[model samples]
Target chain A: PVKHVLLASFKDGVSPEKIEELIKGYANLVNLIEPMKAFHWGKDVSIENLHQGYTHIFESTFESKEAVAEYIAHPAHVEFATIFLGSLDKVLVIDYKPTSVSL
Target chain B: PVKHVLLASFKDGVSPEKIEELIKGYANLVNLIEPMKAFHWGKDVSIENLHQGYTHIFESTFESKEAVAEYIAHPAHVEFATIFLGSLDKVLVIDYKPTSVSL
Candidate 1:
């Protein structure tokens, strides 16, 4: 199984309501994709000094690399990306294979 | 509305199952609290190097400071805290009020 993590930050002046809207929209798109085991997304509430401009984190798990690749190439994903890419300032992506011990 | 943000990091070797369990427990507790407008929680998926040891973030909103105080003092919250505090290595918390324009 593969897990994909995406951290994205929006430009200044972006409202939380907008962020919430984006998340809801993405959640809908994610639900339609096959081989997705689970998905979770939320805004950062940490008041610590360590936070950068990133305001949100999205995590999704798939059964395999091929499933994830399908998600990435999905037209819905591409359309969603266009909505935020212009106003987005930073993005971080990480993928990992689940280990038996970790599971 | 008043929003409380909590960031917590677990010790190494803590399994995701445990984290998910804790979150489910907290969600139940939060549902019992009156005046809570919203509650959202999730694990950090950022592949970025900026992450501290903290792996989870919990965000909640209430109608007022009194409601938040009630949540803080609630016995359920205290019980949840005890389970997490010992296993958790670090914690960060922040509170904010909803802005009219920001909402």
Candidate 2:
């Protein structure tokens, strides 16, 4: 499956409570359209200052590249973009397929 | 260099634009108090369909295992958790040193 790795940054002068609500809102949106195989997110929990990377990180999976396209094209993503985009100034994104252990 | 691989999905009824904003918002918080070198993020670009993949990923290089403790202790990361815990309902997270060949 394909994953969409995203590093998001909240905007300046943004309300912490509002951001949290939007985050939950994002989660609700996913529930609205179950397009992805799975979803997860959390902050960096590394013990050392390696790259000293972004604070928030997330991932989602799909069956194939087409699935990703289907997701982007789906009305769900567009609906999600509004608040997600509204909350941050810019984000660092990447897509990588995870290797599952199969005998 | 350690990489935190992630797979995530947005919830139902969320605005695409808002998450985008939070993504950038997430970035800003890290810069506030972290040793970030560079941050990058985007969607899938591969031509293959790997059903065994997540939607997103985050690759971070740590100085050592200490960063995990340090990161979690960091106030910025604490604030980050608010959005993280709030954003995606669930996520698949993996921490690894992205095999690197540094001279």
Candidate 3:
């Protein structure tokens, strides 16, 4: 399976309330596509894992690359990003295939 | 729970064998610490997730930040880094606490 991993930092004036919208918006992610299966996000808890000011990491997995594209273009996602993106200074995205999985 | 997520890229002239050695080294990660539970790494499959030259993402989890510290100081982890770090030109790590999970 393929997963889209994103590490993002908040921009100037972005508030906790704005972040909540993004968090609540994630609940709709799985519903936006047929093959998308999961979604999760977290806050940085260790200094070793911290990269300057980037404070959060978001990850989601799909059945294929096409699924990721569909999500990227989905209006719900775009609507979420309209506010979410405006609040982030920088974002890092990495997409990959797990050769192994255990959790 | 916490995770140590790493995105890394190999340096110039690094051989495939070196990457193989690094992959094998990951198998020992969870065993080196008490609370460490899972280990996984994968190759980037999406251009959107791609970071210019970086090619792989490695992630491991522990019960707490202290466990991450212990594993970071573990001799086996150090030994693995001796070879693995040598080949990496750049790496990005963002440790965080998952506020949500669904899969």
Candidate 4:
């Protein structure tokens, strides 16, 4: 069973080239963290005409709250943050923990 | 400022190495779609003990419902979808549009 979910979005105008490069450069950072059960990332296909300058999406899951915290505090994670902060204009994030028995 | 937002999540065990490579491979697909105002992507930092086997979050904003439709229908995007469908286990997604003037 998984424990925590995190969501983050970045502002527009940043080139796809740069985004691709960052992922390549920081691929190891994700692996270095602990309690990571799985990792998958890609683009959003649902955004219709109504969305404003939004692009790219990243999704990750961890084992527990403790795992998430450790990943955040880990030095490698901090370094990964630098890549985003330096490149993105604005970012919005959210977190969710499931409560339902079926989901 | 923004009209619509798209959010997507994936299941765990997907490798960071593969995730990074996919982003690199699909860099152009996103750009070729409709009326893209901005684009940004990264990993999640807030997974805790309550989440299920979730990993990776993707957020993208579009100009309107029509833009989202165009993006979804675009041939290039369809190609992008093939990449994820072949590799990912599960995915969750959400969309939002600004209702207030301040945001």
Candidate 5:
């Protein structure tokens, strides 16, 4: 499966309840988009100072690069991004296919 | 489990063999550090222009906050960083505890 990871920090005045609603919307994308397989999210809990201002982390799984492209152009996702992106102060998105290594 | 994520891009002239060696050293850390549970790594394959400049992605799972701290202080990890950090032109590290939600 391909992994889609997103790290974000909400704007200063975004309330806790608003954040909850935004997350709910993100998880719901799994159901709305046919190719999206799983949704997992988290709050930064590191003891290190390496987070670079990101506080929320999320992962979504897809079957392939094609599936991810479908999810990207899906209407549901496009609509959700307007609200989701507005709430973010900082965000980083990266997608990759897990690589096998012999160690 | 806590998810420790690292996104990095190598410096301009680094050889492919050197990249493989650094990644191998990273995967080997799980064997050297008891608290580090799993390692998953990948090369950036996104079609989107959202990645900033990151090229490699890595995820390490840890049992707990204390375990992560121990892994950070482990002699093997400290020693490995000299080579790993030197190879990166850009890097971002973030750790988070998976948050659960009903959607």
Candidate 6:
């Protein structure tokens, strides 16, 4: 699986209720888009103050790198991005093939 | 578990060999530090040009948010940071309590 990690910072005055709705929308993509296998999310909880202003994280797993292209171009994702991108003051998306290192 | 995500961009001219060694040194911390529960890492493979210059991803899980404090101050981590931070031109760290959304 390809790990897709997105870090986002909401613009000033973005409502908590709206943020909640947006997240649900993003997560719901898994149901609409076939290859979006999983979704997990969270907010910055670091004691180190090193978040670099990113407040929320949206992580999803895709079947393959090509699956990601499908997700990006899919009508569901494109429609969601209108509200999603509009709410963010800053955003970052990164994909990686996770390698587990043994003890 | 608390999720810790670190995004890093290595400095220009840093050798691949050194990056691998530093990653090994980092992964080895789980053995030395009692609270660091898991470590997984990878390089960026996003086709979307939205990574914002971050090239690497290091994700780890701690037993608790407090355990993260322990990992930060642990002698092993402190020793590792000297070499690790020196190699990175840019880095971002964020911790979140992952909430999995149901299908």
Q: Which candidate has the top score in DockQ?
A: 6
Q: Which of candidates 3 and 5 is the stronger one according to TM-score?
A: 5
Which sections of candidate 6 miss by over 4 Å?
none
- lDDT by residue for model 5 (A31-63), tens: 899999999998887766777778888999999
Clashing pairs in 5: none
Give the per-residue lDDT of model 3 (tens digit) for B1-103.
Answer: 6788888888888788877777767756776656668878887776654354558888887778787778877887778777777877777778777676444
| Residue range B31-87, candidate 4, lDDT tens digits | 586554444444443433322344444444577667666766778878877887566
The runs of at least 3 residues in candidate 1 whose Cα sits more than 4 Å from the true structure, single-residue gaps closed, are: A1-103, B100-103
Report residue B4 deviation for candidate 4 (angstroms): 13
Give every collision pair in model 6: none
TM-score for chain B of each model, two decimals: 0.82, 0.72, 0.82, 0.71, 0.95, 0.94
Off-target runs (Cα >4 Å) in candidate 2 are A47-53, A100-103, B1-103
Interface RMSD of each: 8.9, 13.2, 2.8, 13.8, 1.3, 0.9
Cα distance off (Å), candidate 4, residue B103? 40
What's the candidate order when arranged by decreasing TM-score? Answer: 6, 5, 3, 2, 1, 4
* Candidate number with greatest lDDT: 6
Over the stretch A17-38, how does candidate 6's per-residue lDDT look in tens digits?
9888889989999999998999
Chain A alone, TM-score per model? 0.80, 0.77, 0.80, 0.70, 0.95, 0.94
Interface RMSD of 2: 13.2
Residue-level lDDT of model 1, residues A50-85, one tens digit each, is 445556666677887777777877777788778866
Docking class of 5: medium
DockQ versus reference, model 1: 0.09
Local error of candidate 2 at A45, Å? 3.7
Give the winner by TM-score: 3 or 4: 3
- The DockQ for candidate 4, computed on C-alphas, is 0.06
**Model 2 reaches what TM-score against the true structure?**
0.49
Q: What docking grade applies to model 2?
A: incorrect
Candidate 3 TM-score for chain A: 0.80
The worst-scoring run of ten residues by lDDT in candidate 2 chain B lies at B94-103
